[PDB]
Design an enzyme around this catalytic site. Structure first.
Site, PDB file in Angstrom:
ATOM      1  N   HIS A  13       0.817  -1.206   0.000  1.00  0.00           N
ATOM      2  CA  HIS A  13       0.000   0.000   0.000  1.00  0.00           C
ATOM      3  C   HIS A  13       0.852   1.258   0.000  1.00  0.00           C
ATOM      4  O   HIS A  13       0.332   2.331  -0.328  1.00  0.00           O
ATOM      5  CB  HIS A  13      -1.009  -0.004   1.174  1.00  0.00           C
ATOM      6  CG  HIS A  13      -0.426   0.340   2.511  1.00  0.00           C
ATOM      7  ND1 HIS A  13      -0.142  -0.616   3.467  1.00  0.00           N
ATOM      8  CD2 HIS A  13      -0.112   1.534   3.072  1.00  0.00           C
ATOM      9  CE1 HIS A  13       0.346  -0.028   4.549  1.00  0.00           C
ATOM     10  NE2 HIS A  13       0.370   1.277   4.337  1.00  0.00           N
ATOM     11  N   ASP A  39       0.961  -7.606   2.729  1.00  0.00           N
ATOM     12  CA  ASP A  39       1.254  -6.218   2.376  1.00  0.00           C
ATOM     13  C   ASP A  39       2.772  -5.992   2.292  1.00  0.00           C
ATOM     14  O   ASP A  39       3.361  -5.210   3.036  1.00  0.00           O
ATOM     15  CB  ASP A  39       0.592  -5.305   3.402  1.00  0.00           C
ATOM     16  CG  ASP A  39       0.410  -3.892   2.902  1.00  0.00           C
ATOM     17  OD1 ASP A  39       0.869  -3.562   1.796  1.00  0.00           O
ATOM     18  OD2 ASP A  39      -0.186  -3.101   3.637  1.00  0.00           O
ATOM     19  N   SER A  91       3.710   2.624   8.248  1.00  0.00           N
ATOM     20  CA  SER A  91       3.685   1.730   7.096  1.00  0.00           C
ATOM     21  C   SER A  91       5.078   1.415   6.557  1.00  0.00           C
ATOM     22  O   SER A  91       5.802   2.309   6.113  1.00  0.00           O
ATOM     23  CB  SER A  91       2.846   2.382   5.994  1.00  0.00           C
ATOM     24  OG  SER A  91       1.475   2.414   6.334  1.00  0.00           O
TER      25      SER A  91
END
EC number: 3.4.21.19
Lengths: 202, 204
Positions: free
Chosen positions: A44, A86, A159
């Site tokens: 992402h 991810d 992230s």
């Protein structure tokens, strides 16, 4: 609780990397150098570039918004993990001195994860978006769950931040969520080996 | 006979170390990594640096003159064996990556020498001067004399002497041509000298 890192080029912190991607603004994220021209981060995160890897700037060992001690490296190839986690590899070009990102810093050591177990102490180190831009922060935490490609740990992480064990080896890549990370198990390791021939799995 | 080692970073060979000292030339010897920051070699090798440890470059697992897979560590402190034997500890500084020499290779195991006897098969492994520079060679031989700090064998300076278990029983220093080769025997006195100076020494 989080502590800012100031000597971002020393010890195991130099491979921690700050990611900048413009969009009417920008997305930022974190990653970790793991090969001569490779970093690990989230799907992402690299998706923010909308298929164009040279939209991604990677600043290894970034200390603040006006202090990139290792310059920057521009993305060249996005290699997503085929499985449903991810995780993506980002391959970066050499810099304006034809140095390689794996040459200006030491690539991180990946853990085989043979010894990783719940209740283990870990750290998550990266660039939280609730702090000043491109400042590196390390949080302490405890593994609370390991299953398949999922590793949860016990505030929040940015992230793509590498998750480190007591030996300063990467056991997982934070992706969000307890906090969730991509657990670097055997399948993830073979994915890395398939693409990063100098990957250092100890 | 003797055979070149090519996979110098595998198994017990990684601790075997090439030593380079500039002197209108250079001298080269051998040694063996035995601690986080420590190698064993001869007195007459470290004497080549004329008192300055920074003149000594130590290349663990050196394969050839253009192939140092574990790079180089620079001499920081020379610690001679107090007794009358050709043995010295060389403490080395971290490398340009701030790695310690005992983290980049596995430190060799030392023998307690409780089982060492004459006629036992051994190897001598290091970087002989009659071979191209920094090439590692292993030489098979046989113990013929043990006495005090002196271990002699049939078949170089600083090369570790390994027993069958790949433990270091001695440090080669010379001999008399056409008669015998000589090493410093790692006896209880030498063993205690190692303990006094090398915190993480591994004696089995």
């Amino acid at each position: 609780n989080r502590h800012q890192i100031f000597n971002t080029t020393q010890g195991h912190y130099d491979a921690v990397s700050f990611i900048y991607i413009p969009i009417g603004g920008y997305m930022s994220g974190s990653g970790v150098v793991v090969g001569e021209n490779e970093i690990l981060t989230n799907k992402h995160v690299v998706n923010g570039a909308k298929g164009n890897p040279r939209n991604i700037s990677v600043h290894p060992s970034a200390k603040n918004e006006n202090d990139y001690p290792n310059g920057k490296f521009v993305g060249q190839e996005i290699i997503p993990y085929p499985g449903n986690s991810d995780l993506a590899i980002l391959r970066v070009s050499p810099n304006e001195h034809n140095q390689h990102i794996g040459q200006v810093v030491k690539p991180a050591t990946i853990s085989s994860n043979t010894d990783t177990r719940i209740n283990e102490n870990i750290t998550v180190t990266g660039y939280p978006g609730d702090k000043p831009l491109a400042t590196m922060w390390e949080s302490v935490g405890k593994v609370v769950y390991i299953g398949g490609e999922e590793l949860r740990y016990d505030v929040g992480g940015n992230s793509g931040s590498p998750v480190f064990n007591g030996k300063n080896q990467v056991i997982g890549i934070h992706y969000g969520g307890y906090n969730s990370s991509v657990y670097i198990n055997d399948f993830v390791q073979q994915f890395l080996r398939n693409n990063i021939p100098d990957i250092n799995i100890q």
